[PDB]
Symmetry: D2
Subunit: 141 residues, 4 copies
């Protein structure tokens, strides 16, 4: 069915000037952009956004990086969007993306496992949580 | 447990200059205001916000009224907030509120069944939906 | 003529539960609230908002305090609003406000010179800058 | 000197899927994107945004079109940004743009005089007004 998912273009991809190319990719893939904004996570908000990983070893690095500069979030809508967007961005490790998914966003714009260009919701539950964290219903148009 | 709920001060109460008194009441009742903003529903958004009532006879009147002027929404947090806030605002019919709940918000500031001063989420499920409709996680502070 | 000015309710007054009473005061004084929101200054933003005082000795304390917790900003509209609102809030030193302007907001809710409850634009030029810093034209309704 | 200007990607360019390519163009031209969001003008807001043209014959058509669907606004920052961005988008009539400025945004993505893909501030004064209309200082990051 038609679904909504969240992507966030990370500070590394922002700095590389990849924003337009990244959005264009999702447009060409046939998604509708339903919400879009540039903003900046505070460390606290980034921590809340990533609450599920608070126990993980990479947590602090992730929170700091994701609050180190402005990011751009978008709500993408389309058939099977959550699963399809995951596949489009590719594996978390940018280097591995270049090895196994050479057309993926992370292969094209990601540097490594931390500076990997982009985030996307990994499940229906996480999509619901993440979209609401960033955008209100008033912002979805 | 500690809960969050949504209130919206409606155009009638806004015009009456009741906004400060209404917020003060919830403050005195011991709630934390976690989010707050003045905005205006488009007819479309008001329709979406009230989707559950699309079948009801009052629907069009409600949507028009709720988009007829600016409103103010707040997220209220506190122990048992959802049920407590419902009780504080009182029955939907302002006139009946004056009869059976004379200290309720609707008794004090409501006019009738339509111009009844204020909205509050009526359940945990509707609270979750309504809060996200109006406020993002970024706006809850 | 009819003017617009900005107020911000500071963290001290927020913690005291004074928000509703403060807004009510301005409503009773005959002002229209044209915009309203709860948000939180980052230290960087608070610094920008107060750029004119960057040279002053109190600057760092002010910036830290104003980013120490959530605040609420409102746009107030009315005849001669800028000068009238200044007079309603009273002198910067809360203690002095109690001595020379006992009905002022700062006399009622302020503690001292730093925790002085509320901010208001001090001139037409600063009003224009401050309103735009906090609210877009899209948020003025 | 370094300046800020506003662009708005119009509903026609949005529908053509041109958003990514348009932003990428400005990135390649060496501008920083300081703010970005997808939103929708109400007819009233579009009218306010375009107040200078209220007397013009095209006014009503412009207001309706610009409120006919979601748009995307960005703040662009760079040396001589206001003048440079004007030149990049090209003449208002998309067809004339293809004739005299074949590399301009409007030549590439515009259809005619009304569906001409994109708006940009035409002067320092209008830039100041337009940026503030769409984005608060809190949204510029």
């Amino acid at each position: 069915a038609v679904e909504r998912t969240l992507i966030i273009v990370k500070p590394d991809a922002m700095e590389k000037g990849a924003l337009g190319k990244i959005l264009d990719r999702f447009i060409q893939e046939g998604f509708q952009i339903k919400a879009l904004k540039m903003f900046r996570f505070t460390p606290e908000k980034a921590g809340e956004f990533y609450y599920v990983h608070r126990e993980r070893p990479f947590f602090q690095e992730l929170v700091e990086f994701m609050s180190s500069g402005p990011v751009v979030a978008a709500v993408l809508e389309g058939e099977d969007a959550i699963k399809r967007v995951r596949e489009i961005i590719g594996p978390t490790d940018s280097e591995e993306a270049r090895k196994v998914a050479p057309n993926s966003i992370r292969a094209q714009f990601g540097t490594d496992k931390g500076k990997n260009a982009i985030h996307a919701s990994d499940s229906p539950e996480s999509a619901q949580y993440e979209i609401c964290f960033i955008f209100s219903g008033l912002e979805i148009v």
